[PDB]
Amino acid sequence: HGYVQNIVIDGESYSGYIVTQFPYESNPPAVIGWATTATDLGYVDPTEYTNADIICHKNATPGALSAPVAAGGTVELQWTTWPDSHHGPVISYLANCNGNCSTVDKTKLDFVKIDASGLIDDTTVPGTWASDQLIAANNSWTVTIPETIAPGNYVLRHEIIALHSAENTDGAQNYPQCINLEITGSGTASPTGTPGEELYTPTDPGILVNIYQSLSTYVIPGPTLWSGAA
Ligand SMILES: *[C@@H]1O[C@H](CO)[C@@H](O)[C@H](O)[C@H]1NC(C)=O
Ligand SMILES: *[C@@H]1O[C@H](CO)[C@@H](O)[C@H](O)[C@H]1NC(C)=O
Ligand SMILES: *[C@@H]1O[C@H](CO)[C@@H](O)[C@H](O)[C@H]1NC(C)=O
Ligand SMILES: OC[C@H]1O[C@H](O)[C@@H](O)[C@@H](O)[C@@H]1O
Ligand SMILES: *[C@H]1O[C@H](CO)[C@@H](O)[C@H](O)[C@@H]1O
Ligand SMILES: *[C@H]1O[C@H](CO)[C@@H](O)[C@H](O)[C@@H]1O
Ligand SMILES: *[C@H]1O[C@H](CO)[C@@H](O)[C@H](O)[C@@H]1O
Ligand SMILES: *[C@H]1O[C@H](CO)[C@@H](O)[C@H](O)[C@@H]1O
Ligand SMILES: [Cu+2]
């Protein structure tokens, strides 16, 4: 359980959607993070992989703000304290809004995988994962905006999938978090994305998986990493 509470881009800081506070305010601030009803700080499970909740988490609505970032620059996402038990991959996607992201129809976002890390080392079961690297780096993850991606208004969908109960059908726990970015630069690529409701299935090898054994490989779920990615 947890959420993205802060975002840093080239020395400027942007509050996340503080789901522990904003849902209970009459006038919460405008932020680049999407609002969600995931008030218990929980997850989306595989029974919702074809439903709108998997896109940007439960009942999510776009943030009213966007953060500028140069193509080729970095975006740092700062999570709340992530529990070590929640081992799994850390996956990040960009989707062009082709318009103002704050009024986008989230079912029309086609997500391009631009960053993904999975099982790092399994010499001691259940292994060291991207989520453990995230914990060690001050509970944060940094992604690079591909330098060739065309400028525009994009959603960054940043996600931890916790696998500690994924040995059972519908056991995986997806924690997606969306923020709005205004990407600048001289990129010209418009890679093909995947609709959020088509990213994952409940039987994917990285989704239905028993991490309490030595794994020789872990297939990170979702579409292929885009060749333009860092
Ligand atoms: C989430 O959206 C559904 C579908 O419109 C709605 O029925 C439900 O009440 C919402 N849940 C909230 C706002 O907590
Ligand atoms: C994008 O839409 C939001 C929500 O209506 C609005 O507040 C904001 O001003 C818009 N951004 C621009 C650059 O027009
Ligand atoms: C570590 O994370 C906290 C909150 O998650 C943040 O306030 C702090 O600036 C971060 N430190 C660095 C060096 O990024
Ligand atoms: O449009 C998708 C396409 O965009 C990139 O710029 C190319 O390098 C290809 O490797 C990739 O498949
Ligand atoms: C490691 O070993 C497993 C069998 O457990 C294979 O499925 C995998 O391809 C790799 O060789
Ligand atoms: C667990 O054992 C497997 C072989 O099945 C190795 O691939 C892995 O590195 C770990 O030693
Ligand atoms: C082991 O093999 C799988 C493919 O079966 C890869 O996806 C993984 O990254 C590792 O190389
Ligand atoms: C990942 O890579 C494959 C080809 O390697 C593409 O077909 C796909 O669209 C994604 O960019
Ligand atoms: Cu949890």
Curated annotation (Swiss-Prot):
Positions carrying Methylhistidine: H1
Disulfide bonds listed in the record: C56-C178, C97-C101
Taxonomic placement: Eukaryota, Fungi, Dikarya, Ascomycota, Pezizomycotina
Catalytic reactions of this protein: [(1->4)-beta-D-glucosyl]n+m + reduced acceptor + O2 = 4-dehydro-beta-D-glucosyl-[(1->4)-beta-D-glucosyl]n-1 + [(1->4)-beta-D-glucosyl]m + acceptor + H2O
Keyword Membrane attached: no
Record text about domains: The extra C-terminal domain (residues 249 to 328) participates in protein stabilization and protects the enzyme from thermal unfolding.
Name of the protein: AA9 family lytic polysaccharide monooxygenase A
Binding-site residues, Cu(2+): H1, H86, Y175
Gene Ontology MF: a single term: monooxygenase activity
Organism: Talaromyces verruculosus (Penicillium verruculosum)
Keywords: Carbohydrate metabolism, Cellulose degradation, Disulfide bond, Glycoprotein, Methylation, Monooxygenase, Oxidoreductase, Polysaccharide degradation, Secreted, Signal
Gene for this chain: lpmo1
Biological process per Gene Ontology, one example term: cellulose catabolic process
